[PDB]
């Protein structure tokens, strides 16, 4: 199925 996308909240 679909692969979930995420991001680091701090940069």
């Amino acid at each position, epitope marked *: *199925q*679909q692969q979930q*996308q*995420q991001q680091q*909240q*701090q940069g």
Partner: antibody
Amino acid sequence: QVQLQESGGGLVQPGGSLKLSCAASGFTFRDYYMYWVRQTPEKRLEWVAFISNGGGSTYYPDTVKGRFTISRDNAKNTLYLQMSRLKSEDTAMYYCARGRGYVWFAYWGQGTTVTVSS
Amino acid sequence: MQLVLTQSSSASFSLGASAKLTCTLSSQHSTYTIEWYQQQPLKPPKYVMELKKDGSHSTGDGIPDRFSGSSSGADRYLSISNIQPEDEAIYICGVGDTIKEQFVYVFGGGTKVTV
């Protein structure tokens, strides 16, 4: 200790506009992604805006895209939400939020209510 | 299909007992990591934990260890061992999908837990 405090809510009419503010502290504001999330009178939670750490990117769900505008002033440690062409459905408690790790809404403010009449 | 979250029915519990709250991801997204939020009356929602497909999780700050999570396919569970009056709240799950073309974030309709 991370703290976020919203303000700017009040009574308005459909088609009007108002701008909300979120004073942030207890952390380095310019390093984190910020968000606005709202809660309808029915108590349903709903994400409404995203802005990257330096203001480079913004995203909105279709319900407000084109009407709302999220922005930030990093020197003032303040997040904003310009609400235009208000709709009855915009009536809700508005929360300012900051993330942590991969979690979008790690920290929430106290909220400010926006009431659209008529 | 649309990214949706379906939460178990609202129910009451007895102190010391154990609770299991369910949040079901839409089949097409059964591998997704979700979040559990706890909102007490007239209080802002509060971050409880991040729950992955393998059931592994990390709780937020201020969350008693009597809070744990697990998975079962598309289901994501919030377990509350023992129970106290302070656990009385609305528990809502959410799931984000930072798709470059367009961000998405859905919340379930919440599960009201009485004690």
